[PDB]
Amino acid sequence: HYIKHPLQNRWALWFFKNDKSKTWQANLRLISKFDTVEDFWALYNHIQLSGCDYSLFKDGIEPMWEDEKNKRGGRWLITLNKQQRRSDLDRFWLETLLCLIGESFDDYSDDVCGAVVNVRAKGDKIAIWTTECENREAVTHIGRVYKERLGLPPKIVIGYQSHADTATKSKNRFVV
């Protein structure tokens, strides 16, 4: 009936089905792809009415450190307490998906790879993944706009961790 409204990029929704008897990548599942506003909303409305983690990454980028577009990058991390799953999780996740498909970081949105939400009994987490941890100007601009877009209290920092550092964990490259 109507002409669909194209998004700037094509996106893929992935999920991680926690299965301890399998190696990490064997639990990744690519659910579906979309490149219009109407197809995004249909998928979002469908998931809402249905550690089982999810991610939205640009087409061609797998949601893993191993991917060529992620190996030299990192993520802005938002940590929620147990009480924030009910009051803030869904709002923070939708606002993060909108930053992605709407290219809310202007030219710096070209550095965005995707976003990951970790559903944990001990506390949920949401991250925006970027392609180059050494791109200080792009990384910091994305972080400041993301923190503001989510209405986070200014005094508390959010940290940007390089995937190389997260993978050899035993520390924040930038804070905003």
Task: Identify which of residues 54 and 105 has a Cβ nearer to ligand WXL in the complex.
Answer: 54
Q: How far is the CB of 75 from ligand WXL (least distance, A)?
A: 9
Spell out the alpha helix ranges (H) of 127-176: 136-149, 163-167
Q: How far is the CB of 68 from ligand WXL (least distance, A)?
A: 13
Contacts 24+ apart (CB under 8 A), 59-68: 59/9, 59/10, 59/11, 59/12, 59/33, 59/35, 61/12, 61/113, 61/114, 62/14, 62/28, 63/14, 63/28, 63/114, 63/116, 63/129, 64/25, 64/28, 65/163, 65/166, 65/167, 66/25, 67/113
Strand partners, 116: 55, 127
Q: How far is the CB of 167 from ligand WXL (least distance, A)?
A: 7
Task: Identify which of residues 53 and 141 has a Cβ nearer to ligand WXL in the complex.
Answer: 53
Q: How far is the CB of 18 from ligand WXL (least distance, A)?
A: 9
Residues making contact with ligand WXL (CB under 6 A): 14-16, 24, 53-55, 63-66, 116, 118
Task: Identify which of residues 13 and 141 has a Cβ nearer to ligand WXL in the complex.
Answer: 13
Does the annotation list 151 as a binding residue? no
Task: Identify which of residues 38 and 119 has a Cβ nearer to ligand WXL in the complex.
Answer: 119
Known binding positions for mRNA:
24-25, 65-66, 120-125, 168-170
